[PDB]
Amino acid sequence: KLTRTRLDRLYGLPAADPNNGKEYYEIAGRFSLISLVPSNDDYQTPIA
Amino acid sequence: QNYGINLPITGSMDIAYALTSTLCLYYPTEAATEINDNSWKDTLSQLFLTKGWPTGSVYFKEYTNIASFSVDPQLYCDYNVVLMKYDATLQLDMSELADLILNEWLCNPMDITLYYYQQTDEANKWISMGSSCTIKVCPLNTQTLGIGCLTTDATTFEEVATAEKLVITDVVDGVNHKLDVTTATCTIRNCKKLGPRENVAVIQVGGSDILDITADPTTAPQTERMMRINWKKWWQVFYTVVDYVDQIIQVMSKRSRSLNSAAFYYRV
Numbered sequence: 361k362l363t364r365t366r367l368d369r370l371y372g373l374p375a376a377d378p379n380n381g382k383e384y385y386e387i388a389g390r391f392s393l394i395s396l397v398p399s400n401d402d403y404q405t406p407i408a
Numbered sequence: 409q410n411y412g413i414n415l416p417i418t419g420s421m422d423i424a425y426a427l428t429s430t431l432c433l434y435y436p437t438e439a440a441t442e443i444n445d446n447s448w449k450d451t452l453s454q455l456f457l458t459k460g461w462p463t464g465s466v467y468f469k470e471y472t473n474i475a476s477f478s479v480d481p482q483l484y485c486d487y488n489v490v491l492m493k494y495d496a497t498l499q500l501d502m503s504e505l506a507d508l509i510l511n512e513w514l515c516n517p518m519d520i521t522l523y524y525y526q527q528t529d530e531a532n533k534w535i536s537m538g539s540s541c542t543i544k545v546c547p548l549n550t551q552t553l554g555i556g557c558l559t560t561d562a563t564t565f566e567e568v569a570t571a572e573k574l575v576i577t578d579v580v581d582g583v584n585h586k587l588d589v590t591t592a593t594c595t596i597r598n599c600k601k602l603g604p605r606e607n608v609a610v611i612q613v614g615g616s617d618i619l620d621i622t623a624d625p626t627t628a629p630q631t632e633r634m635m636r637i638n639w640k641k642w643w644q645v646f647y648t649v650v651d652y653v654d655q656i657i658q659v660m661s662k663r664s665r666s667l668n669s670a671a672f673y674y675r676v
Contacts (some may be wrong), residue, residue, distance in 0.1 A: 402558060402560055402561050403558065407553060407558075408553075
């Protein structure tokens with residue numbers, strides 16, 4: 361709700377004070393990364 | 409008397425020359441479940457008494473499954489007769505079990521973490537026993553390097569088994585082989601086939617006889633100690649076994665390594 365305005369019941373965070381007493385919004389979780397890594401093998405090496 | 413020295417034995421042909429046993433049986437548990445009775449052992453003991461062998465000394469043991477019987481068999485007895493169920497999908501299990509229980513194997517431990525290995529005779533076979541055996545092997549030429557598999561890695565090996573309860577393996581003579589097996593559950597031993605064992609005979613309770621006892625594909629003979637009969641009910645099988653007990657005793661004999669005189673010959 362914005363005081364002294366023509367619209368109330370606003371939705372979504374304002375662009376003025378998006379933090380309001382917090383610096384980092386810590387988010388802990390598990391990530392799985394199945395990627396196409398560029399690497400041939402333990403091959404591509406002199407045999408000796 | 410003198411032991412451990414092979415000496416000539418004198419003989420003749422004009423001199424006129426021409427019990428206390430201990431029987432044991434191994435059978436799978438499905439027979440016991442099907443017979444629906446538990447007092448049958450007393451009947452078998454009485455029938456053995458009728459033929460002539462004393463009671464009290466006869467022991468019976470059961471195994472949950474042919475795989476359960478496969479891992480570390482125990483054979484301390486005088487006349488071993490084992491009933492092995494036949495199948496059309498598990499030929500190698502029966503073959504390896506009969507081969508292991510039919511011939512004596514002088515074995516040594518194998519450490520595949522600090523050594524290499526090679527064969528030097530036609531009786532050199534590798535026996536793996538455990539709960540989860542997966543033998544992974546990469547051949548090495550005379551220059552000690554991998555062919556078709558890199559020695560540095562181990563996943564690229566050419567496997568010969570996968571979670572097998574027991575697996576007998578043979579390798580090409582004259583070359584080294586680097587091995588990597590999960591030793592935390594399964595053991596690999598280097599055994600040499602010294603000679604035949606008559607103390608154990610196997611009766612294939614089933615159909616098409618498929619047993620081979622020789623590692624070379626050239627010869628696959630049918631030994632006399634390998635018996636085979638048809639079956640629908642286990643009581644018929646037991647009746648046939650007890651009726652022909654004399655033939656089974658005649659074809660078999662006392663173990664050729666515990667005669668109380670063959671000492672210092674790898675037994676007693």
